[PDB]
Amino acid sequence: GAKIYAQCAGCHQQNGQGIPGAFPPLAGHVAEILAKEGGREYLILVLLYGLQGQIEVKGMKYNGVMSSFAQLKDEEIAAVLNHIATAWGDAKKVKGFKPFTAEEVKKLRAKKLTPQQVLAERKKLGLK
Amino acid sequence: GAKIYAQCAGCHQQNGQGIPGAFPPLAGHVAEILAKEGGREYLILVLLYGLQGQIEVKGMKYNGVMSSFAQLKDEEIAAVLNHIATAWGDAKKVKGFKPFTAEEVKKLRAKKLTPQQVLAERKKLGLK
Ligand code: HEC
Ligand code: HEC
16 A cells, blocks of 8 residues: 555655656645545545646646556555555644545446546635 | 556556657657667666656657656566567567666666756667
8 A cells, every 4th residue: 555656656756746847746735635525535536537637736737647547446546545645744734534445446436437527526626 | 577567557558659748659669769779778767767858759749757767676677678678569670689688777777867868868879
């Protein structure tokens, strides 16, 4: 569950800062997405389905593509999330959130959505 | 050594297409870089140090960026390095063609370059 995050070095970087300019800050930014309910739903989504479509995160906008892995077993995922949700301080800031879990992960394979579909649900939540 | 290449959801893809404005295609596309006197180090630089800038993709120009695959060890890095290499029929073109002697690397591990910099070494070899 951090080893995973490691399987592809780069993208969102060992630091969570990822690498601003091309990948957004998971860095702490995961909280603000983890606050706003469903968020921990939006996140689940992302790795399973993929996301795309110009977006703004901490003002610097992005527009790129990010793939889904949706291969990693509900397990495999389930983790490399409470990992990016804690492993730079976030389970912190955010209220004692219930961690992640696999049934919830297959609970969504269902959804069987798309890179845009997915943005749509990032729309639902907004910002500031 | 291709399992590695695998750790990466999306990216240059598997059919190794990659995808306009985003990630250029290596499938096919790597016949060329090898057929120069660096094409073969460089890859290591690309891989090793990062790459940033618009460039020619047997047609398109991307403005994308490529994180550094810093983190991986030496061996692993000649693996994929031998994979994108072989995987989509490119070495099946190139002469006195060799395996990414997991050494050919510690060999070019130094320069301590940088994205634009290797963006440089690119256009040195002679491209766009
Ligand atoms: C691995 C090689 C990659 C690549 C190429 C990208 N990511 Fe991700 N990513 C994650 C989350 C939660 C988001 C959303 C952030 C938000 O909504 O504010 C992102 C988003 C992206 C984008 C932005 C999409 C766009 O519209 O342009 C891009 C380009 C992107 N990523 C690329 C989460 C993660 C991970 C967490 C488990 C992992 C691993 C990755 N991303 C990996 C990659
Ligand atoms: C996964 C983490 C990724 C992501 C997001 C990208 N790559 Fe690579 N890549 C490789 C090579 C040889 C090139 C360029 C070849 C040439 O110069 O013609 C690329 C380039 C990119 C770019 C474009 C670069 C730019 O600055 O515009 C981008 C956006 C990009 N990649 C994304 C080689 C490889 C690999 C070979 C071993 C691997 C693995 C990856 N790339 C992985 C990723």
